[PDB]
């Protein structure tokens, strides 16, 4: 076969003097190395068998080293070499559509990635001059997110909640929903995505590449993967490597997005890795600088000014909490780095509100209110009509009857609550959202039954995409819902309501 022989003539057998430190111990991943005089801190050192490692502690006698791999091929008396480089990963657009490990080697088997430029995992966030405020929107296609808790481009938003409530699905409808902009024509409405899998078994990450490839979502993302089987210094290095492929886009013009799933598993890989280096424990045996661990990460998510390129880098960190308690140590340290949050609960998921977003508590510094112009009209009034609902709609035990007074307002909420529910891996558009939200707030649904609105939605939505395609194209193009555009929609809802149930 011609492929094996051409791989062996391209191999370079270069030999040079190394700089070399004999091993004194090896246990549980830590290799105290005698020698290694001129070593830097955070330098990448290379064992004899092919392993790789990073020298963290410097000390007068020994040199502490942690291993990127497995510590059973390493025996006392081995040889540790010097590369001569603080730890760096490859970068580029050439990694797009791949699954890679935490140092940039492909675990999909499509071959060697041809990459040209290398970028550190420990670089610095930009300061005060080269930013700008948040001008643009980032559409998720969820209807409880886009209307009530909008997210700008360049804003760190925290998805927080328990296990098995919707934290991964929320951030995968977002990956799917940008399919419509990426095959379009303008280069400033796209959104290239990145998913970082920390502490997850391979029978979830090889299954999420399936869900992202029938919908052809994988042609514009990267998956940096550090599974639960990996060395504890490989789950620590993963978000600092994934964030550094995001800043190929942001430092060259385009717009990126990055999900850390999750960041409660980049902390217990720092607690273990830095207890076996004999560093004294803090609270819950976490180190002193877990706040400095997350903060030097979540400040690269910038929004540059237009004299640098104007690119953005959103971030969506996921956080799993125990028993729904938000006052823990690692939650509160990362609530106060992000601009806004999305509080996912369990009693919302089980009563029926799915996606289970607490729209009361899901606060957001609105991002210079870049919702969009037409959604401001219909979800401006929706925000207040739902807020009016929640103050007054928690009895479950009625004794008196005020249908002219109270029962009209709470009938507007259940029509807007059951409108907000959604499916899974089928995200809408924004003008298909303006139409369905128009029909809810304008009183055109109070003569239905609430057990029929989820049935009313898909029959409505199929009618407008089929028969009214030139209608929705004037909302997406002109931005606003104009007064003559208010006129045309006034018949369509009432013509359909005249013949919906028959």
């Amino acid at each position: 076969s011609s492929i094996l022989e051409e791989r062996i003539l391209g191999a370079d057998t270069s030999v040079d003097l190394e700089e070399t430190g004999r091993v004194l111990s090896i246990g549980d991943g830590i290799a105290r190395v005698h020698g290694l005089r001129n070593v830097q801190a955070e330098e990448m050192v290379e064992f004899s068998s092919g392993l790789k490692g990073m020298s963290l502690n410097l000390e007068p006698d020994n040199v502490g080293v942690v291993v990127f791999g497995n510590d059973k091929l390493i025996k006392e008396g081995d040889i540790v070499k010097r590369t001569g480089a603080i730890v760096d990963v490859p970068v580029g657009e050439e990694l797009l559509g791949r699954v890679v490990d935490a140092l940039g080697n492909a675990i999909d088997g499509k071959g060697p990635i041809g990459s040209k430029t290398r970028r550190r995992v420990g670089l610095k966030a930009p300061g005060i001059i080269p930013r700008i405020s948040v001008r643009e929107p980032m559409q998720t296609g969820i209807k409880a997110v886009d209307s009530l808790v909008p997210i700008g481009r360049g804003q760190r938003e925290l998805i927080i909640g328990d296990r098995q409530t919707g934290k991964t699905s929320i951030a995968i409808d977002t990956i799917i929903n940008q399919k419509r902009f990426n095959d379009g024509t303008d280069e400033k409405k796209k959104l290239y995505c990145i998913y970082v899998a920390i502490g997850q078994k391979r029978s979830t990450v090889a299954q999420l590449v399936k869900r992202l490839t029938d919908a052809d979502a994988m042609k514009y993302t990267i998956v940096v993967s550090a599974t639960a089987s990996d060395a504890a210094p490989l789950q620590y290095l993963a978000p600092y490597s994934g964030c550094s492929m995001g800043e190929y886009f942001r430092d060259n013009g385009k717009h990126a997005l990055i999900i850390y799933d999750d960041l409660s598993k980049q902390a217990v890989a720092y607690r273990q890795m830095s207890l076996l280096l004999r560093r004294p424990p803090g609270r819950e045996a976490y180190p002193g600088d877990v706040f400095y661990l997350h903060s030097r990460l979540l400040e690269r998510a910038a929004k540059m000014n237009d004299a640098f390129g104007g690119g953005s880098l959103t971030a969506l960190p996921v956080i799993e909490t125990q028993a729904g308690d938000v006052s823990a140590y690692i939650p509160t340290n990362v609530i106060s780095i992000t601009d806004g949050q999305i509080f996912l609960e369990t009693e919302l998921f089980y009563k029926g509100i799915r996606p289970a977003i607490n729209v009361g508590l899901s606060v957001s510094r609105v991002g210079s209110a870049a919702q969009t112009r037409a959604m401001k009209q219909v979800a401006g009034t929706m925000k207040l009509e739902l807020a009016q609902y929640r103050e007054v709609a928690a009895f479950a035990q009625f004794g008196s009857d005020l249908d002219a007074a109270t029962q009209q307002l709470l009938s507007r909420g259940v029509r807007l609550t059951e409108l907000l529910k959604q499916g899974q891996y089928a995200p809408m558009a924004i003008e298909e959202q303006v139409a369905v939200i128009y029909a809810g707030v304008r009183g055109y649904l109070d003569k239905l039954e609430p057990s029929k609105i989820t049935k009313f939605e898909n029959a409505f939505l199929s009618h407008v995409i089929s028969q009214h395609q030139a209608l929705l194209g004037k909302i997406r193009a002109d931005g606003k819902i104009s007064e003559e555009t208010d006129a045309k929609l006034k018949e369509i809802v009432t013509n359909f309501l005249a013949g919906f149930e028959a």
Partner: protein, 70 residues
Amino acid sequence: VQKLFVDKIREYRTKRQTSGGPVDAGPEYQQDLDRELFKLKQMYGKADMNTFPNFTFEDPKFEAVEKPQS
């Protein structure tokens, strides 16, 4: 190590003298390539080499509606 460069090409050319697949398979490669050839067909399906699609479909029968009117 160009003396090792010649010595892994020259024992690659010896592998290019092949008669029937494996050189030292015995009961190893014969069982494994037959175990794997079933698994690409076991949970996949029973399919021949060139047989076309052979079936037939029947549509919904159009019933009538009886209606005395006026």
